[PDB]
Design a protein around this ligand. Structure first.
Ligand SMILES: [Mn+2]
Ligand SMILES: [Mn+2]
Lengths: 168, 60
């Protein structure tokens, strides 16, 4: 919060992020220069991540839900983070878009080069689609998983170490 | 710079020793120095970059 409120830099050539509840058009933009393989600016990556954290820290201490009748399940099991896999699930189904229940029940953050990027967009979608978008712990999302498959150091190169501490 | 931070993380101490020992190189060796500062957040900025943000009234 302090780092963002200090605005060390504010915005970047790719993203245009809002203060909170980033538009679906900007979530789309963010995905389509993950095709281009660009990154968020550190302040704006923190800005979404602290807001995501706050929302997740308020949300029910463990989740039980009555699912509604006409709505169609999309599930991912493990999807060890890859940008083509994100494109390919947007072939497999339409957009989650508060329109279909979208459960990400997987290892996502590990064993693929694009793995912080997968959670960066999926966390955005969870802020914008809260009620029937549910993102469940893999085992491989846990702390030590990132040491054994290097993600801890892969983030540390991509961004300074505090980013990886926030993701942990 | 994406590699420079790996080099500086490994060999920063040697680089400081140069500033201590080489009276001839040190003026040019300092420019390779990186530090945290209050306004540099969790990133290290060069001493020359520090001046770029220096206030009009600072002498130091
Ligand atoms: Mn797995
Ligand atoms: Mn697993």
């Amino acid at each position: 919060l302090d780092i963002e409120s200090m605005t060390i830099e504010d915005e970047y050539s790719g993203p245009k992020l809002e203060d909170g509840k980033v538009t679906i058009s900007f979530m789309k933009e963010l995905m389509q220069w993950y095709k281009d393989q660009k990154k968020l600016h550190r302040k704006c990556a923190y800005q979404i991540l602290v807001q995501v954290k706050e929302v997740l820290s308020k949300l029910s201490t463990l989740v039980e839900t009555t699912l509604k009748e006409t709505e169609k399940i999309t599930v991912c099991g493990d999807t060890h983070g890859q940008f083509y896999d994100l494109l390919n699930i947007f072939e497999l189904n339409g957009l989650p878009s508060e329109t279909n229940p979208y459960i990400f029940n997987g290892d996502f953050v590990d064993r693929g080069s694009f793995s912080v990027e997968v959670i960066l967009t999926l966390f955005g979608f969870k802020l914008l689609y809260p009620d029937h978008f549910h993102l469940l712990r893999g085992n491989a999302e846990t702390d030590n998983m990132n040491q054994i498959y290097g993600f801890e150091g892969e983030v540390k190169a991509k961004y300074t170490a505090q980013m990886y501490e926030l993701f942990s | 710079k994406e590699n420079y931070k790996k080099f500086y993380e490994a060999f920063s101490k040697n680089l400081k020793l140069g500033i201590h020992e080489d009276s001839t190189n040190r003026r040019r060796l300092s420019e390779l120095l990186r530090y945290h500062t209050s306004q540099s957040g969790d990133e290290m900025t060069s001493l020359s970059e520090y001046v770029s943000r220096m206030k009009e009234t600072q002498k130091s």
